Amino acid sequence: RVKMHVKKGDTVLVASGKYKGRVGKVKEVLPKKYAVIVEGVNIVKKAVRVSPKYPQGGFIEKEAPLHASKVRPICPACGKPTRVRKKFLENGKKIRVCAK
Amino acid sequence: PKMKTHKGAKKRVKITASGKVVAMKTGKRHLNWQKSGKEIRQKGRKFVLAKPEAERIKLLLPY
Amino acid sequence: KKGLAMAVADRAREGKLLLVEAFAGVNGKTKEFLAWAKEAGLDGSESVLLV
RNA sequence: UAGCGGGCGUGGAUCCCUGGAUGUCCGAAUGGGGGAACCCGGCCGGCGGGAACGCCGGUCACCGCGCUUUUUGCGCGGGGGGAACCUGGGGAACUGAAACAUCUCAGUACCCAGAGGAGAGGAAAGAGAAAUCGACUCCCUGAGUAGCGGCGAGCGAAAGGGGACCAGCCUAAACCGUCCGGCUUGUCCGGGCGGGGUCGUGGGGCCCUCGGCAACCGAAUCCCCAGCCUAGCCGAAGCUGUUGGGAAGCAGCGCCAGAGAGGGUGAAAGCCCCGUAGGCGAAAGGUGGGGGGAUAGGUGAGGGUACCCGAGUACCCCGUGGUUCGUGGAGCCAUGGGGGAAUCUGGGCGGACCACCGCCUAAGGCUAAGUACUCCGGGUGACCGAUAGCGCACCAGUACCGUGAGGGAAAGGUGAAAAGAACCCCGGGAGGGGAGUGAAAUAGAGCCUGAAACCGUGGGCUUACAAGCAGUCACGGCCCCGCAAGGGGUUGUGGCGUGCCUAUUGAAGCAUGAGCCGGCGACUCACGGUCGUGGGCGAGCUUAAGCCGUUGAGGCGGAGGCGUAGGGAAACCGAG
Ligand SMILES: [Mg+2]
Ligand SMILES: [Mg+2]
Ligand SMILES: [Mg+2]
Ligand SMILES: [Mg+2]
Ligand SMILES: [Mg+2]
Ligand SMILES: [Mg+2]
Ligand SMILES: [Mg+2]
Ligand SMILES: [Mg+2]
Ligand SMILES: [Mg+2]
Ligand SMILES: [Mg+2]
Ligand SMILES: [Mg+2]
Ligand SMILES: [Mg+2]
Ligand SMILES: [Mg+2]
Ligand SMILES: [Mg+2]
Ligand SMILES: [Mg+2]
Ligand SMILES: [Mg+2]
Ligand SMILES: [Mg+2]
Ligand SMILES: [Mg+2]
Ligand SMILES: [Mg+2]
Ligand SMILES: [Mg+2]
Ligand SMILES: [Mg+2]
Ligand SMILES: [Mg+2]
Ligand SMILES: [Mg+2]
Ligand SMILES: [Mg+2]
Ligand SMILES: [Mg+2]
Ligand SMILES: [Mg+2]
Ligand SMILES: [Mg+2]
Ligand SMILES: [Mg+2]
Ligand SMILES: [Mg+2]
Ligand SMILES: [Mg+2]
Ligand SMILES: [Mg+2]
Ligand SMILES: [Mg+2]
Ligand SMILES: [Mg+2]
Ligand SMILES: [Mg+2]
Ligand SMILES: [Mg+2]
Ligand SMILES: [Mg+2]
Ligand SMILES: [Mg+2]
Ligand SMILES: [Mg+2]
Ligand SMILES: [Mg+2]
Ligand SMILES: [Mg+2]
Ligand SMILES: [Mg+2]
Ligand SMILES: [Mg+2]
Ligand SMILES: [Mg+2]
Ligand SMILES: [Mg+2]
Ligand SMILES: [Mg+2]
Ligand SMILES: [Mg+2]
Ligand SMILES: [Mg+2]
Ligand SMILES: [Mg+2]
Ligand SMILES: [Mg+2]
Ligand SMILES: [Mg+2]
Ligand SMILES: [Mg+2]
Ligand SMILES: [Mg+2]
Ligand SMILES: [Mg+2]
Ligand SMILES: [Mg+2]
Ligand SMILES: [Mg+2]
Ligand SMILES: [Mg+2]
Ligand SMILES: [Mg+2]
Ligand SMILES: [Mg+2]
Ligand SMILES: [Mg+2]
Ligand SMILES: [Mg+2]
Ligand SMILES: [Mg+2]
Ligand SMILES: [Mg+2]
Ligand SMILES: [Mg+2]
Ligand SMILES: [Mg+2]
Ligand SMILES: [Mg+2]
Ligand SMILES: [Mg+2]
Ligand SMILES: [Mg+2]
Ligand SMILES: [Mg+2]
Ligand SMILES: [Mg+2]
Ligand SMILES: [Mg+2]
Ligand SMILES: [Mg+2]
Ligand SMILES: [Mg+2]
Ligand SMILES: [Mg+2]
Ligand SMILES: [Mg+2]
Ligand SMILES: [Mg+2]
Ligand SMILES: [Mg+2]
Ligand SMILES: [Mg+2]
Ligand SMILES: [Mg+2]
Ligand SMILES: [Mg+2]
Ligand SMILES: [Mg+2]
Ligand SMILES: [Mg+2]
Ligand SMILES: [Mg+2]
Ligand SMILES: [Mg+2]
Ligand SMILES: [Mg+2]
Ligand SMILES: [Mg+2]
Ligand SMILES: [Mg+2]
Ligand SMILES: [Mg+2]
Ligand SMILES: [Mg+2]
Ligand SMILES: [Mg+2]
Ligand SMILES: [Mg+2]
Ligand SMILES: [Mg+2]
Ligand SMILES: [Mg+2]
Ligand SMILES: [Mg+2]
Ligand SMILES: [Mg+2]
Ligand SMILES: [Mg+2]
Ligand SMILES: [Mg+2]
Ligand SMILES: [Mg+2]
Ligand SMILES: [Mg+2]
Ligand SMILES: [Mg+2]
Ligand SMILES: [Mg+2]
Ligand SMILES: [Mg+2]
Ligand SMILES: [Mg+2]
Ligand SMILES: [Mg+2]
Ligand SMILES: [Mg+2]
Ligand SMILES: [Mg+2]
Ligand SMILES: [Mg+2]
Ligand SMILES: [Mg+2]
Ligand SMILES: [Mg+2]
Ligand SMILES: [Mg+2]
Ligand SMILES: [Mg+2]
Ligand SMILES: [Mg+2]
Ligand SMILES: [Mg+2]
Ligand SMILES: [Mg+2]
Ligand SMILES: [Mg+2]
Ligand SMILES: [Mg+2]
Ligand SMILES: [Mg+2]
Ligand SMILES: [Mg+2]
Ligand SMILES: [Mg+2]
Ligand SMILES: [Mg+2]
Ligand SMILES: [Mg+2]
Ligand SMILES: [Mg+2]
Ligand SMILES: [Mg+2]
Ligand SMILES: [Mg+2]
Ligand SMILES: [Mg+2]
Ligand SMILES: [Mg+2]
Ligand SMILES: [Mg+2]
Ligand SMILES: [Mg+2]
Ligand SMILES: [Mg+2]
Ligand SMILES: [Mg+2]
Ligand SMILES: [Mg+2]
Ligand SMILES: [Mg+2]
Ligand SMILES: [Mg+2]
Ligand SMILES: [Mg+2]
Ligand SMILES: [Mg+2]
Ligand SMILES: [Mg+2]
Ligand SMILES: [Mg+2]
Ligand SMILES: [Mg+2]
Ligand SMILES: [Mg+2]
Ligand SMILES: [Mg+2]
Ligand SMILES: [Mg+2]
Ligand SMILES: [Mg+2]
Ligand SMILES: [Mg+2]
Ligand SMILES: [Mg+2]
Ligand SMILES: [Mg+2]
Ligand SMILES: [Mg+2]
Ligand SMILES: [Mg+2]
Ligand SMILES: [Mg+2]
Ligand SMILES: [Mg+2]
Ligand SMILES: [Mg+2]
Ligand SMILES: [Mg+2]
Ligand SMILES: [Mg+2]
Ligand SMILES: [Mg+2]
Ligand SMILES: [Mg+2]
Ligand SMILES: [Mg+2]
Ligand SMILES: [Mg+2]
Ligand SMILES: [Mg+2]
Ligand SMILES: [Mg+2]
Ligand SMILES: [Mg+2]
Ligand SMILES: [Mg+2]
Ligand SMILES: [Mg+2]
Ligand SMILES: [Mg+2]
Ligand SMILES: [Mg+2]
Ligand SMILES: [Mg+2]
Ligand SMILES: [Mg+2]
Ligand SMILES: [Mg+2]
Ligand SMILES: [Mg+2]
Ligand SMILES: [Mg+2]
Ligand SMILES: [Mg+2]
Ligand SMILES: [Mg+2]
Ligand SMILES: [Mg+2]
Ligand SMILES: [Mg+2]
Ligand SMILES: [Mg+2]
Ligand SMILES: [Mg+2]
Ligand SMILES: [Mg+2]
Ligand SMILES: [Mg+2]
Ligand SMILES: [Mg+2]
Ligand SMILES: [Mg+2]
Ligand SMILES: [Mg+2]
Ligand SMILES: [Mg+2]
Ligand SMILES: [Mg+2]
Ligand SMILES: [Mg+2]
Ligand SMILES: [Mg+2]
Ligand SMILES: [Mg+2]
Ligand SMILES: [Mg+2]
Ligand SMILES: [Mg+2]
Ligand SMILES: [Mg+2]
Ligand SMILES: [Mg+2]
Ligand SMILES: [Mg+2]
Ligand SMILES: [Mg+2]
Ligand SMILES: [Mg+2]
Ligand SMILES: [Mg+2]
Ligand SMILES: [Mg+2]
Ligand SMILES: [Mg+2]
Ligand SMILES: [Mg+2]
Ligand SMILES: [Mg+2]
Ligand SMILES: [Mg+2]
Ligand SMILES: [Mg+2]
Ligand SMILES: [Mg+2]
Ligand SMILES: [Mg+2]
Ligand SMILES: [Mg+2]
Ligand SMILES: [Mg+2]
Ligand SMILES: [Mg+2]
Ligand SMILES: [Mg+2]
Ligand SMILES: [Mg+2]
Ligand SMILES: [Mg+2]
Ligand SMILES: [Mg+2]
Ligand SMILES: [Mg+2]
Ligand SMILES: [Mg+2]
Ligand SMILES: [Mg+2]
Ligand SMILES: [Mg+2]
Ligand SMILES: [Mg+2]
Ligand SMILES: [Mg+2]
Ligand SMILES: [Mg+2]
Ligand SMILES: [Mg+2]
Ligand SMILES: [Mg+2]
Ligand SMILES: [Mg+2]
Ligand SMILES: [Mg+2]
Ligand SMILES: [Mg+2]
Structure with missing residues (x-):
């Protein structure tokens, strides 16, 4: 409950520390x-x-x-914050520039 | 919490306008029998105390 | 009362008092108010008590 | 909560909220017994071949109330728990009075009964001096006043005024109808039900004259809705370089802001993450007079008559309690005992008693709000930060102690990440040494920092003819830091030298206290005074509860208090 957070099993960039810059698909989230x-x-x-x-x-x-x-998530460009946008049927998160 | 005025004092001492404190002279209700007429006339007045007189005031204050 | 006066007064003698009116930057919006203060000598360099 | 070993999920799981289901046994515990959690049954039905045995489902405690034709039964209710708050029935002592007995502590502690989200109180047989107020409760004030008091210690009201809240009702009796029982037929004797009635301008009953009412009030009872609650959702704005183990730091440029609250992210982030400002949301359950509707109820004027208006009550006496009231001149309210009325030309009260003048209607009951508390939820701190803070930050009312009631601890910290040290070596193991991880391993696992007592290894100076509160002054030697005039460590000789604290006339005292170290440890706060002091105002000064406003913002509020006149026990008079 409420734990929901940035991204899931998919592509993402690491702005961490040792592996800053590096990028890869998240193979697991706990x-x-x-x-x-x-x-x-x-x-x-x-x-x-x-x-x-x-x-x-x-x-x-x-x-x-x-x-x-x-x-941080990433899409057709660089790593960018999520912004949840809903269509006419349901809801799918759009990135700050493009979609999904 | 909020001092109670001492009724024993209030009942027998008057605190004067300037600060002094007066009360009746002692020994006059039954000590006599023929004691000089001069005695009872002078025992009839009231007087001022001094140091207890300042102790006295503390027992009042709302008064 | 005196204090409230002396405060306003003290602040007036310094010359840092300023009555206004022409709040062209009405309707709650920071960026707008920023413009108004810009064109008003409130460069945000000094702490302002906006009454 | 990882491991072994298996599964589930976008045909949308886990999870959250709502309702429902199942819920062994004990426990008010309720079929009965019982040493709680166990044992044994009656009745009806079911299962196993099932008579004997066993299991399963249902049912069977007691008390109160209403019925039930009585019987037997049927229905509604009760029982126990709850942190504190509330009412009631009982009710101490230490202590204070510098002894003590009246008195005080105190109707407090506690025991018991009961009520509820509150409880109590509550529509004047009131207050008490104004021919005045108009249920009750709560705050301010009046007031430490009035007064009580071995007039000791000490206790201590009310009216009134300022505020919060605001509400008023139902009966009994006369009288009429009905049913049941009764006698000696009467508007009769009793009982149940319905109508009638409800108050101090005294009301009502029954009669006579007028609306033969539409109307007007209207719930504290219902019903609908808003709203709120029990899950949630949307939510603006940043990139480059740079040092670093790690940027959030630094440097450059840039943006958002109804959002620059806060938390997290390897360090210090408005723009990275959760959020924040501002908005949106319920099929279901709870709440809901704030708005709306309905019903229950409810209401006029004269005249007549003397029908009714709460009984072992009023009233008086005896013994007591309550109140500020301790027997006091002692009323008023209450009542254990005795005597014992009246129904308004009646009764109670205004501090013995009497007259006058007034106030109020006892002996039936109900009533929301304002108020109290904090088991529970949230928010906030010039609140603690693991000897603190709840006894408990931790698997604590535990361990452990006690027959029992009961007592009651200690114990938080690796790192950003487990990356928790493979493998080799010595060892039975423990534990180490290599290696390896990490920024750091002197972060290595009870692992952050790691003080002191205390124990030990190495090194410098020193000591076996010397008598000591252990130091101090001088000189001298050795060692060591600036080659260098200096300073540090050490101590040989010489001079001098009666620990610390407490208590005392007097202590090195053979008077007291301390093994040593670390931490905990003692003049506070509230209210009321008195003096001083820093200010504001000034014959004036100041508000209290509360209200409005905020969400660390203030203002309104003169009721009241002090001062401007004193003297007197007082009536009274007054710069006297
Ligand atoms: Mg998600
Ligand atoms: Mg780096
Ligand atoms: Mg006071
Ligand atoms: Mg006294
Ligand atoms: Mg005398
Ligand atoms: Mg005499
Ligand atoms: Mg004689
Ligand atoms: Mg003589
Ligand atoms: Mg004389
Ligand atoms: Mg706007
Ligand atoms: Mg904007
Ligand atoms: Mg703006
Ligand atoms: Mg698991
Ligand atoms: Mg795992
Ligand atoms: Mg699968
Ligand atoms: Mg399908
Ligand atoms: Mg689904
Ligand atoms: Mg349920
Ligand atoms: Mg459920
Ligand atoms: Mg259930
Ligand atoms: Mg079952
Ligand atoms: Mg039993
Ligand atoms: Mg039963
Ligand atoms: Mg047993
Ligand atoms: Mg059977
Ligand atoms: Mg068989
Ligand atoms: Mg059978
Ligand atoms: Mg059975
Ligand atoms: Mg049975
Ligand atoms: Mg029975
Ligand atoms: Mg009984
Ligand atoms: Mg019965
Ligand atoms: Mg009966
Ligand atoms: Mg009945
Ligand atoms: Mg019967
Ligand atoms: Mg019978
Ligand atoms: Mg019966
Ligand atoms: Mg029942
Ligand atoms: Mg409890
Ligand atoms: Mg009681
Ligand atoms: Mg005593
Ligand atoms: Mg005392
Ligand atoms: Mg004593
Ligand atoms: Mg004493
Ligand atoms: Mg004694
Ligand atoms: Mg006594
Ligand atoms: Mg008492
Ligand atoms: Mg009491
Ligand atoms: Mg008593
Ligand atoms: Mg007593
Ligand atoms: Mg009882
Ligand atoms: Mg109870
Ligand atoms: Mg209850
Ligand atoms: Mg209730
Ligand atoms: Mg109530
Ligand atoms: Mg309430
Ligand atoms: Mg009540
Ligand atoms: Mg009360
Ligand atoms: Mg009551
Ligand atoms: Mg008079
Ligand atoms: Mg008048
Ligand atoms: Mg009044
Ligand atoms: Mg009245
Ligand atoms: Mg009251
Ligand atoms: Mg109160
Ligand atoms: Mg109040
Ligand atoms: Mg006296
Ligand atoms: Mg005495
Ligand atoms: Mg008392
Ligand atoms: Mg009053
Ligand atoms: Mg009042
Ligand atoms: Mg209030
Ligand atoms: Mg209020
Ligand atoms: Mg009969
Ligand atoms: Mg008969
Ligand atoms: Mg009868
Ligand atoms: Mg009759
Ligand atoms: Mg009859
Ligand atoms: Mg009858
Ligand atoms: Mg009626
Ligand atoms: Mg009438
Ligand atoms: Mg009449
Ligand atoms: Mg009402
Ligand atoms: Mg919810
Ligand atoms: Mg919620
Ligand atoms: Mg939105
Ligand atoms: Mg969001
Ligand atoms: Mg870029
Ligand atoms: Mg950087
Ligand atoms: Mg720096
Ligand atoms: Mg910068
Ligand atoms: Mg530019
Ligand atoms: Mg932070
Ligand atoms: Mg900073
Ligand atoms: Mg900082
Ligand atoms: Mg800084
Ligand atoms: Mg931050
Ligand atoms: Mg808008
Ligand atoms: Mg909103
Ligand atoms: Mg919000
Ligand atoms: Mg809404
Ligand atoms: Mg929703
Ligand atoms: Mg609903
Ligand atoms: Mg709906
Ligand atoms: Mg439904
Ligand atoms: Mg419902
Ligand atoms: Mg509910
Ligand atoms: Mg609710
Ligand atoms: Mg309710
Ligand atoms: Mg409406
Ligand atoms: Mg109606
Ligand atoms: Mg009439
Ligand atoms: Mg007649
Ligand atoms: Mg009678
Ligand atoms: Mg009678
Ligand atoms: Mg009686
Ligand atoms: Mg007698
Ligand atoms: Mg009596
Ligand atoms: Mg008495
Ligand atoms: Mg006496
Ligand atoms: Mg007494
Ligand atoms: Mg007396
Ligand atoms: Mg007498
Ligand atoms: Mg009398
Ligand atoms: Mg009696
Ligand atoms: Mg009479
Ligand atoms: Mg009369
Ligand atoms: Mg009379
Ligand atoms: Mg009476
Ligand atoms: Mg009487
Ligand atoms: Mg009276
Ligand atoms: Mg008498
Ligand atoms: Mg009266
Ligand atoms: Mg009655
Ligand atoms: Mg009430
Ligand atoms: Mg109430
Ligand atoms: Mg309050
Ligand atoms: Mg709480
Ligand atoms: Mg709380
Ligand atoms: Mg809290
Ligand atoms: Mg703190
Ligand atoms: Mg500790
Ligand atoms: Mg506790
Ligand atoms: Mg403890
Ligand atoms: Mg705990
Ligand atoms: Mg706790
Ligand atoms: Mg355990
Ligand atoms: Mg525990
Ligand atoms: Mg302890
Ligand atoms: Mg960790
Ligand atoms: Mg590594
Ligand atoms: Mg491990
Ligand atoms: Mg090793
Ligand atoms: Mg080796
Ligand atoms: Mg080996
Ligand atoms: Mg061994
Ligand atoms: Mg080993
Ligand atoms: Mg190593
Ligand atoms: Mg270290
Ligand atoms: Mg070292
Ligand atoms: Mg371990
Ligand atoms: Mg450990
Ligand atoms: Mg260890
Ligand atoms: Mg050490
Ligand atoms: Mg150590
Ligand atoms: Mg050490
Ligand atoms: Mg050593
Ligand atoms: Mg050594
Ligand atoms: Mg050595
Ligand atoms: Mg050396
Ligand atoms: Mg010799
Ligand atoms: Mg010495
Ligand atoms: Mg020398
Ligand atoms: Mg030397
Ligand atoms: Mg040499
Ligand atoms: Mg040398
Ligand atoms: Mg030296
Ligand atoms: Mg020496
Ligand atoms: Mg020497
Ligand atoms: Mg010596
Ligand atoms: Mg001595
Ligand atoms: Mg001696
Ligand atoms: Mg000795
Ligand atoms: Mg001795
Ligand atoms: Mg001694
Ligand atoms: Mg000694
Ligand atoms: Mg000592
Ligand atoms: Mg010691
Ligand atoms: Mg000793
Ligand atoms: Mg020892
Ligand atoms: Mg110590
Ligand atoms: Mg401590
Ligand atoms: Mg201290
Ligand atoms: Mg002191
Ligand atoms: Mg003070
Ligand atoms: Mg003071
Ligand atoms: Mg001054
Ligand atoms: Mg001044
Ligand atoms: Mg002054
Ligand atoms: Mg003037
Ligand atoms: Mg006040
Ligand atoms: Mg108001
Ligand atoms: Mg407000
Ligand atoms: Mg407020
Ligand atoms: Mg505020
Ligand atoms: Mg605001
Ligand atoms: Mg603020
Ligand atoms: Mg205020
Ligand atoms: Mg204002
Ligand atoms: Mg006034
Ligand atoms: Mg005034
Ligand atoms: Mg005035
Ligand atoms: Mg006024
Ligand atoms: Mg006063
Ligand atoms: Mg004066
Ligand atoms: Mg006088
Ligand atoms: Mg005169
Ligand atoms: Mg003159």
């Missing part, structure tokens, strides 16, 4: 923690195997979720 996952903030988890089962678990450079406010 509203509980208020954080999203793109293709940056990859981190070295030298940890052995993840789950109790299986052989090697991999040092996977898995993408670490970013604070949901560190990513």
